[PDB]
């Protein structure tokens, strides 16, 4: 019954496409047409963190908006003091091929994972006065692409085996597995309520998952190549994705479709990282051109450019207070913009 | 007070910097190698007191287009070749012409020369106008029946390698051994140093 099942699957996709087209009465650009432009945005490199040896794949801001962790392929996990540029921790990793890092939203733990297929949890606040591997989460059959703490005892990880997993750090077991992607899940972002999360994979598709139930709610397909980056809007009702097709796109959870595309003819490089500002008015995206573009989220205009890195911009983040933007790059430097 | 604890924060940074210098020594003195044919296996060997660290991917899916970008600042990629041959020809084409792998050298091991001697003309109906290049040296005592096939396979890989001048990468074909990787990494680093001085 392969033909019939494929025949049914192509009658539901057209039903979904017709349903989405019915709700598309006026575009986002038509509604924010009569809004004041953001204007030219000048951000300057306020800090430059110069400790890492190899290229940097990931960084993650602390909830206090002062400390941040960064992961580099030399086999190091450095925790920075963004205000004083002082290194607080330098954590050597068992495997040097690390592709992601997360910072617990309590300052207590940091996570990292890579080609070793393991998410390693590191305890920072222990009476022993040193950072040790709190846990090693094994069970993914592909490299770890992203990880985000839900609390001190829950962490969600995306893998290069086309699955996302929810873990119980105390027991070191997968509480839930999220399947349905056909390519390598490259990134994930948690909703502000940590009840949902979106993930983008190497199939030009983004999926909205329910953390508690373990099921997919919605699938978003607007891109043409692999989705490298994903991030929720601050409101939680929308998210933005960056892909290899040199475009960033904004999706709406309630409208279940696309709102805006953030692209220009001069960009033919893929987006590696995306993030919003505190109000969601600016969308910051890193590119393979070694530069980060600032976009007017409601206007799709390029508000500004962060152009201080000598190599591919790999990671990018905005503090919880919105005071600064930190970008990492393959030139082994972290720069803070404000 | 802030001053008293800022001394401790500067002291903690200073201890890290002293260790990060010891880590920098071993990082630059180590030659990383991607052996391409747990989620990754590491092989430790040293030749003439030079540390080589060779990484073989393990539990990874056959879609390499993402995790292979982690191996661009590697010293060389060890490519082992046993239509299986055209599949390895297309994979070497991908690595050679990659945006991020166009500065990475490829040490190419054309393996299975012992079974190749035991037994290709159907997969490549151009291996009928090809004759052993006398510019290269054959192995004495062996008929030109298998050396013609050995050099034909090498010339298919050298057709790819020589077509792209976009990057600072060199291909090193071989016939299958530990010293060959050492000698070729010696040539890779020298060619890189000679390029900083504009001598090459």
């Amino acid at each position, epitope marked *: 019954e392969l033909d019939q099942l494929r025949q049914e699957a192509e009658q539901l996709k057209n039903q979904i496409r017709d349903a989405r087209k019915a709700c598309a009465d006026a575009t986002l650009s038509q509604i924010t047409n009569n809004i004041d432009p953001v204007g030219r945005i000048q951000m300057r490199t306020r800090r430059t963190l110069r400790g890492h040896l190899a290229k940097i794949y990931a960084m993650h801001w602390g909830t206090d908006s002062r400390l941040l962790v960064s992961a580099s392929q030399d086999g190091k996990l450095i925790i920075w003091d963004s205000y004083t540029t002082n290194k607080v921790h330098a954590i050597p990793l068992r495997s040097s091929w690390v592709m992601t890092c997360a910072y617990a939203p309590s300052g207590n733990y940091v996570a990292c994972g890579g080609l070793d297929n393991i998410c390693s949890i590191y305890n920072l606040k222990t009476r022993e006065g040193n950072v040790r591997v709190s846990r090693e989460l094994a069970g993914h059959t592909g490299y770890l692409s992203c990880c985000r703490f839900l609390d001190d005892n829950q962490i969600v990880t995306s893998s290069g085996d086309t699955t996302c997993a929810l873990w119980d750090i105390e027991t070191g077991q997968q509480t839930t597995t999220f399947t349905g992607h056909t390519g390598d899940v490259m990134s994930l972002s948690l909703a502000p309520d940590t009840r949902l999360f979106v993930s983008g994979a190497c199939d030009a598709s983004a999926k909205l998952w329910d953390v508690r139930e373990g099921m997919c709610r919605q699938t978003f397909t607007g891109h*043409e*190549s692999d989705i490298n980056a994903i991030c929720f809007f601050p409101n939680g009702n929308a998210f933005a994705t960056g892909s290899d*097709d040199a475009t960033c796109r904004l999706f709406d959870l309630r409208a279940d479709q696309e709102l805006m595309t953030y692209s220009h003819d001069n960009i033919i490089c893929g987006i590696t990282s995306v993030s919003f500002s505190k109000s969601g008015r600016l969308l910051l995206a890193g590119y393979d051109d070694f530069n980060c573009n600032v976009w007017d989220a409601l206007k799709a205009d390029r508000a500004g450019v962060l152009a201080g890195h000598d190599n591919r911009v790999s990671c990018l983040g905005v503090t919880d207070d919105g005071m600064a933007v930190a970008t990492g790059s393959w030139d082994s430097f972290l720069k803070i913009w404000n | 007070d802030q001053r008293n604890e800022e001394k401790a924060q500067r002291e903690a940074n200073k201890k890290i910097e002293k260790q990060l210098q010891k880590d920098k020594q071993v990082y630059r003195a180590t030659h990383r190698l991607l052996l391409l044919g747990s989620g990754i296996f590491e092989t430790k060997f040293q030749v003439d007191k030079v540390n080589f660290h060779m990484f073989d991917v393990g539990a990874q899916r*056959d879609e390499r*287009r993402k995790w292979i970008q982690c191996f661009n600042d590697v010293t060389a990629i060890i490519f082992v070749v046993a239509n299986r041959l055209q599949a390895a020809l297309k994979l070497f084409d991908s690595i050679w012409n*990659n945006k991020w792998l166009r500065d990475t050298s490829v040490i190419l091991f054309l393996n299975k020369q012992d079974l190749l001697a035991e037994k290709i003309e159907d997969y490549f109906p151009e291996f009928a106008r090809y004759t052993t290049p006398e510019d290269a040296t054959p192995e004495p005592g062996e008929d030109p029946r298998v050396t013609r096939a050995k050099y034909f396979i090498r010339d298919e890989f050298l057709r790819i390698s020589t077509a792209s001048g976009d990057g600072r990468h060199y291909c090193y074909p071989h016939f299958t051994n530990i010293r060959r990787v050492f000698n070729d990494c010696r040539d890779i680093i020298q060619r890189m140093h000679l390029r900083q001085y504009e001598l090459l």
Partner: nanobody, 126 residues
């Protein structure tokens, strides 16, 4: 979304002509290298031919070189494979595969694991 649908194929006597068409949608056709791959019964996916973004750099696998012809209509968003003198070894499911990224001379698209930018395939019996 990125959709690749192949047409043509079926039973043909040893020899004869069989033309494959690949209708593409969900992406800008002219920005990608396009590939042809097949999976013979009892064998894995095998690369057959490719054609560049413009149609200048055309490549084939040796076993079919001189018999098959690949061509793309960038205006019509369609890919072709004119197969001439079909041998019985050419019996396979032929997949129209798109290279993962645009403006790239690089492709990783013969993986048995689900490659997103590959089509459904069409049976070709010789």
């Amino acid at each position: 979304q990125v959709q690749l649908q192949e047409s043509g194929g079926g039973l043909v006597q040893p020899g004869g002509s069989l033309r494959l068409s690949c209708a593409a949608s969900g992406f800008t056709f002219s920005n990608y290298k396009m590939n042809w791959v097949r999976q013979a019964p009892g064998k894995g996916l095998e690369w057959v031919s490719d054609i560049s973004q413009s149609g200048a750099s055309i490549s084939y696998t040796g076993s079919v070189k001189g018999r098959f012809t690949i061509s793309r209509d960038n205006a019509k968003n369609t890919l072709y494979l004119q197969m001439n003198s079909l041998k019985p070894e050419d019996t396979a499911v032929y997949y129209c595969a798109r290279c993962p990224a645009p403006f790239t001379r690089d492709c990783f698209d013969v993986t048995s694991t689900t490659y997103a930018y590959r089509g459904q395939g069409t049976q070709v019996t010789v």
